Amino acid sequence: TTCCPSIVARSNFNVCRLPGTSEAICATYTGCIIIPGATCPGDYAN
């Protein structure tokens, strides 16, 4: 599951994914995170 720190970060994550970039690279690029669960924490609410 991906969790993002702000709207901006999510928007740029989604663009990063368009060519098929791995989630892990899009995570470090944006500040979004990948977690094994489905419940994003309050500081990664977007």
Side-chain angles (χ1 to χ4, degrees):
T1 299
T2 58
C3 313
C4 291
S6 70
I7 285 297
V8 158
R10 178 64 66 177
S11 299
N12 287 339
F13 188 97
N14 288 334
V15 167
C16 179
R17 291 282 287 159
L18 286 172
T21 315
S22 182
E23 287 193 342
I25 284 287
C26 295
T28 52
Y29 163 68
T30 57
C32 301
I33 63 171
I34 302 168
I35 61 167
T39 310
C40 294
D43 56 341
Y44 290 83
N46 302 115

